[PDB]
């Protein structure tokens, strides 16, 4: 997998060498094709994982993501052509390159055989992200948000560093292939009960768990649209990908060491879903929607039943695409409105007829409408959770009712009701804004036709 | 300085560490340490400002008593073994003295009070020498005697330094002292692995030298001893803003940059030796060091502090360039990580 | 560590014994990296000194890309030796002190009862 | 090119990684042994050199 | 030692006088000369860990 990567690196030379006026089209046009080369990995006629080479591999779980990581770079670069079009021609070429490095790094992290290669690349992605959030962040508080995003991930990260070096001494190689075909069975000691927490905690932090998710609402609030898309679509899912490949070892402990997180997540799912119900900042509501719909995932990567896992793989890819779509349209309202407040800007369909159709489809993806991969995902996690304990439906049942309420409230108070009297007149929709959306949903429609590709390792 | 004097002094400041390293007769190692003490004091008071005399008089007393303690260890050994050099048989207290003494000259842990203060009153230039070409000498003496020193003490001085360095740095706003504090911290990691794998001490030093030397020549390019002063870097010289950003995050352990390797292999070696107690606590507060590094990042790069009109005047005039060493030592430092296996 | 080994060359860079090892291919990815590492140093310099970044010092750019690379071949040539000594040393010991490193024979799975923790 | 290429490539990748793993562990055991046993080329700490012991005949007799 | 510029250069400015049994002025042997020899020709080729 060096075509999904080397051609990517070369994007950096192109963003720099290219003309200031033509820099945007060379980069966006080329990475669209970079995504097309990424689609070749999907050709898996057989079960055997495709081990491209010693360090680089792609198995069913990584492949559905590498393609998404390559896909969003085009979109990210199309959603940030407006803001970042007021810059000095060298601030742009920095932002474009920053976005380019994220997927170079993220493509490799999702396509990495050695778990510590994951760690080095895993924690590197913070550098590009922190720059995108802090350097271009509009609000006074991004310095703070950046600190929260760096420390919560970093304090979790050093325990994983110690744990992975620890298993290398215990087993003798951090190669995901071998670690899988070798006998690593923890022994339920008090210490192992700590190892397990060391490995999972760093992944559980960037996958916002109810206890440590305050970093994500603060980060996406002041982050520029491209950073918020990256955090929701690819960055948070780095934590999920890690939990799937790391729990191959630590096989016995999670049977009983998971209860704490599972309950934290399912109760967390309800409270995070509910506070979405009365949050005035739209970007705030989407972020907590992201916490709740990701709290379902940590509760399926821990129950560990075949269906959970691919419920997880289905939902992660699906929610990634949906969340961005929501964060992308939130930005289009923010740029014309100039405020994140949900109460202002009422009645837009009256003035932006189509963006409202995109808003409606994004919300229906947000809630579980049935001919969507989003529902298949939740339906499956729901099933397994029920298997874990029939009572789980109650808590995963209060979340579904709440999820319907906030998803439609975003449509009802942003895209319906009487028009706002006279905010700065709202200029019509650009074709870029609409495509950036179409590019998010057309793939959501196509993937829902053949869900098999994003089903995970389990199935 | 009459250029002749400059030569004699500089030769001594350079013959000082070199005799230490080359000789085996400890005595000759002691005088190497003594010559470094004598040579550095003249340069320290070059401005001869009231702050300076204070600096040198502290540096000298701290250095002198430690030098006398190191000599006492050699004198005691001479009686416990006729040899003029530490051996397997050496009484444990004899070696511990040498650790404390040498940890004072290097300024590690509970003897970390002199360094921040002398780093504050000396010029940026002599600051570098006082931080990096004066650590080579004592460390050489320790690295030579590693097989014999105590694993317990070193670790305590190691951990303490890491903490003191980190905590001290958080509050400081003067750059010279932020660096002094960082050096205390890095010096700590170095002395942690000495008992186990000296060869890594020599890596955690070089990398510190290849990181600090560019960082200081950056601070002086604009001769800013204040963060507020380095924050207006964007107006005085915009290009160094990019690398100053990476070098400081490299000084802390963040993974893509070269700075991770020293911490990573030291942790790998300590876990190989089973100190998974000690290594863990060190790595954790090591993370405190990055917080103050990033706070500076914020002021200098990620956010643009307001500047003064008189600055437009300094822009007009051609900026005297930074020596080539900056570049070669900025890149070899910010990004060599892809070449770690050979380095170790 | 590896110092104190018999025959150690007290101050030599790469003992002739390292002749026996294969020479590093000049295009070894690493030496090529050092090259790029170098070009960047050059470009960076131009930038910090405020010169046209790429179109200036085309002589220097060469000195850099060619100094770093030169250094590489002769360094890697050594680091390669050091690693090679490590095996010579390591493998030898495994034999000279055989009992301590005994070739164990594992049993096939048919015999090994591995515990099954039911997920349920 | 086929199912054959990846299956055979993956087995080659596993053999390199399996052999690297066994050796890395054996290093740690050899390095534990030579440190304590001091009977191997690594960890051979120095003692004075007999090349300076003066074996000459001293005027002072009896020694 | 740390940097053996002495062995390399072949010079011996610091080794000739590190133990009592080394050449004494006017060939006047120092005290204890009967043992240090016996204790360093023993520990020669045997590293410290096994000179102890």
């Amino acid at each position: 997998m060096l075509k999904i990567i080397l051609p990517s690196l070369m994007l950096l030379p192109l963003t720099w060498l290219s003309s200031p006026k033509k820099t945007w089209t060379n980069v966006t046009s080329y990475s669209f094709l970079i995504s097309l080369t990424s689609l070749t990995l999907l050709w898996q006629t057989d079960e055997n994982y495709k081990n491209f080479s010693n360090m680089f591999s792609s198995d069913p779980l990584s492949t559905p993501l590498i393609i998404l990581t390559a896909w969003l770079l085009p979109l990210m670069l199309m959603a940030s052509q407006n803001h970042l079009k007021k810059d000095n021609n060298v601030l742009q070429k920095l932002y474009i390159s920053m976005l380019i490095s994220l997927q170079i790094l993220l493509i490799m992290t999702f396509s990495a055989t050695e778990l510590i290669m994951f760690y080095i690349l895993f924690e590197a992605t913070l550098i590009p992200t922190l720059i995108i959030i802090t350097r271009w962040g509009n609000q006074t508080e991004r310095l703070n948000a950046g600190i929260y995003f760096l420390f919560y991930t970093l304090i979790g990260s050093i325990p994983l560093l110690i744990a992975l070096i620890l298993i290398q001494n215990h087993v003798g190689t951090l190669n995901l292939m071998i670690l899988s075909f070798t006998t690593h069975t923890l022994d339920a000691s008090w210490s192992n009960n700590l190892l397990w927490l060391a490995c999972m905690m760093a992944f559980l932090i960037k996958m916002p768990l109810y206890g440590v998710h305050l970093w994500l609402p603060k980060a996406h609030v002041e982050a520029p649209i491209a950073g918020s898309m990256i955090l929701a679509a690819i960055l948070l899912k780095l934590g999920s990908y890690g939990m799937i490949r790391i729990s191959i070892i630590l096989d016995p402990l999670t049977k009983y060491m998971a209860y704490p997180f599972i309950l934290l997540s399912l109760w967390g799912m309800i409270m995070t879903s509910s506070i979405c119900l009365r949050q005035t900042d739209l970007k705030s509501l989407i972020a907590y929607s992201s916490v709740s719909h990701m709290a379902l995932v940590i509760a399926s990567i821990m129950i560990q039943t075949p269906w959970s896992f691919m419920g997880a793989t289905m939902l992660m890819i699906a929610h990634g695409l949906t969340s961005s779509l929501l964060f992308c349209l939130a930005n289009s309202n923010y740029e014309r409105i100039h405020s994140r407040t949900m109460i202002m800007a009422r009645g837009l369909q009256m003035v932006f007829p189509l963006m409202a159709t995109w808003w409606l489809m994004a919300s229906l993806a947000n809630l579980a409408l049935p001919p969507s991969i989003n529902l298949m995902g939740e339906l499956f996690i729901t099933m397994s959770l029920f298997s874990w304990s029939n009572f789980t439906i109650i808590l995963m049942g209060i979340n579904i009712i709440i999820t319907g309420m906030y998803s439609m409230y975003m449509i009802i108070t942003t895209q319906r009701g009487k028009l706002t009297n006279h905010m700065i007149n709202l200029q019509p929709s650009h074709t870029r804004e609409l495509t950036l959306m179409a590019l998010h949903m057309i793939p959501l429609i196509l993937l829902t036709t053949s869900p098999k590709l994003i089903t995970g390792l389990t199935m | 300085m009459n250029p002749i004097t400059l030569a004699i002094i500089y030769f001594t400041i350079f013959l000082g560490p070199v005799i230490t390293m080359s000789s085996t007769n400890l005595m000759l190692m002691w005088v190497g340490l003594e010559f470094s003490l004598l040579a550095i004091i003249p340069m320290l008071i070059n401005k001869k400002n009231p702050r300076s005399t204070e600096a040198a008089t502290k540096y000298f007393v701290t250095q002198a008593t430690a030098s006398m303690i190191i000599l006492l260890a050699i004198v005691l050994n001479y009686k416990q073994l006729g040899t003029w050099m530490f051996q397997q048989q050496t009484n444990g207290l004899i070696l511990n003295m040498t650790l404390m003494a040498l940890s004072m000259k290097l300024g590690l842990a509970p003897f970390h009070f002199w360094l921040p203060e002398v780093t504050q009153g000396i010029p940026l230039h002599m600051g570098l020498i006082l931080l990096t070409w004066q650590k080579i000498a004592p460390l050489s003496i320790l690295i030579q005697i590693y097989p014999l020193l105590n694993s317990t003490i070193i670790l305590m001085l190691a951990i303490t330094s890491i903490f003191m360095g980190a905590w001290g740095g958080l509050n400081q706003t003067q750059m010279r002292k932020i660096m002094a504090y960082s050096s205390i911290a890095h010096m700590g990691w170095m002395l942690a692995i000495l008992p186990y794998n000296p060869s890594l001490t020599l890596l955690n030093l070089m990398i510190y030298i290849i990181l600090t030397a560019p960082m200081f020549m950056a601070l002086m390019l604009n001769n800013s001893m204040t963060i507020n002063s380095i924050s207006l870097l964007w107006n005085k010289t915009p290009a160094m803003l990019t690398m100053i950003s990476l070098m400081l995050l490299s000084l802390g352990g963040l993974p893509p940059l070269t700075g991770f390797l020293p911490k990573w292999i030291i942790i790998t070696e300590l876990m190989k030796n089973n100190c998974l107690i000690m290594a863990t606590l060190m790595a954790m507060m090591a993370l405190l060091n990055l917080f103050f590094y990033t706070r500076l990042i914020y002021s200098t790069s990620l956010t643009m502090f307001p500047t003064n009109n008189n600055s437009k005047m300094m822009t007009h005039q051609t900026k005297t360039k930074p020596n080539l060493m900056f570049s070669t030592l900025a890149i070899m430092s910010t990004m060599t990580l892809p070449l770690a296996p050979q380095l170790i | 560590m590896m110092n104190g080994r018999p025959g150690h060359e007290p101050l030599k860079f790469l003992p002739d014994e390292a002749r026996s090892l294969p020479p590093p291919k000049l295009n070894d990815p690493r030496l090529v990296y050092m090259g790029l590492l170098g070009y960047c140093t050059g470009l960076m310099d131009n930038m910090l000194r405020m010169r046209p970044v790429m179109r200036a010092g085309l002589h220097r750019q060469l000195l850099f890309v060619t100094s770093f690379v030169f250094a590489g071949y002769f360094y890697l040539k050594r680091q390669n030796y050091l690693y090679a000594v490590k095996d010579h040393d390591m493998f030898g010991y495994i034999k000279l002190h055989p009992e301590d490193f005994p070739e164990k024979e594992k049993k096939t799975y048919a015999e090994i009862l591995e515990p099954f923790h039911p997920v349920r | 090119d086929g199912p054959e290429k990846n299956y055979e490539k993956t087995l080659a990748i596993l053999q390199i990684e399996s052999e690297k793993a066994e050796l890395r562990l054996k290093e740690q055991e050899v390095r534990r042994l030579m440190r304590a046993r001091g009977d191997g080329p690594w960890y051979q700490f120095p003692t004075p050199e007999k090349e300076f012991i003066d074996h000459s005949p001293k005027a002072t007799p009896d020694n | 030692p740390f940097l053996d510029i002495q062995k390399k250069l072949g010079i011996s400015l610091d080794r000739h006088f590190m133990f009592l049994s080394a050449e004494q002025p006017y060939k006047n042997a120092a005290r204890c000369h009967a043992f240090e020899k016996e204790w360093i020709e023993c520990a020669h080729g045997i590293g410290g860990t096994r000179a102890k």
Binding site: - | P341, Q342, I344 | S20, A84 | K20, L23, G38 | -
Partner: peptide, 27 residues
């Protein structure tokens, strides 16, 4: 009596086995 000199590792160097075996470096 005198002690026995440590034995001597013997042979010729051969390129290291599988290369630097550092974390994930095909080298």
């Amino acid at each position: 009596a005198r002690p026995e000199p440590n034995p001597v590792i013997e042979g010729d160097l051969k390129p290291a086995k599988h290369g630097t075996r550092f974390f994930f470096w095909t080298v």
